[PDB]
Design a protein around this ligand. Structure first.
Ligand code: HEC
Length: 104
């Protein structure tokens, strides 16, 4: 995935909900800083749902891949927004940014 397109995709998709950076405020989507290398039900003083915690998986790209195209598929009690990103290309680009961004 391209990091630059990934960056722009995140900004064009998620931005006013998630931050993926150090200082990211709570809002609706938790500041996903430290996503890659953590489990679901492990949010830094953010109010979780009985769906995210129940999952008990890791985030590393694989799970994310489906989740982002199939939010209402992993668990039908989350928030269930748009269909999915665009296709896999953009999504992969997204992951590529995310890998960096969430780390730093
Ligand atoms: C608010 C309007 C959101 C938008 C837009 C996006 N996400 Fe989100 N996301 C949001 C919340 C509140 C949560 C936490 C738990 C829940 O069940 O709702 C999440 C969670 C994720 C996760 C999993 C992290 C975890 O909780 O363990 C990922 C990987 C994720 N979100 C990615 C993501 C991306 C890339 C988005 C744009 C394509 C996106 N989210 C939009 C809230 C919101």
């Amino acid at each position: 995935g391209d990091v630059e397109k990934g960056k722009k995709i995140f900004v064009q998709k998620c931005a006013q909900c998630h931050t993926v950076e150090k200082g990211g405020k709570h809002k609706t989507g938790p500041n996903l800083h430290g996503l890659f290398g953590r489990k679901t039900g492990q949010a830094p003083g953010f109010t979780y749902t009985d769906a995210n915690k129940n999952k008990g998986i890791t985030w590393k790209e694989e799970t994310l891949m489906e989740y982002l195209e199939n939010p209402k598929k992993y668990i039908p009690g989350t928030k269930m927004i748009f269909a999915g990103i665009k296709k896999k290309t953009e999504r992969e680009d997204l992951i590529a940014y995310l890998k960096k961004a969430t780390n730093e």
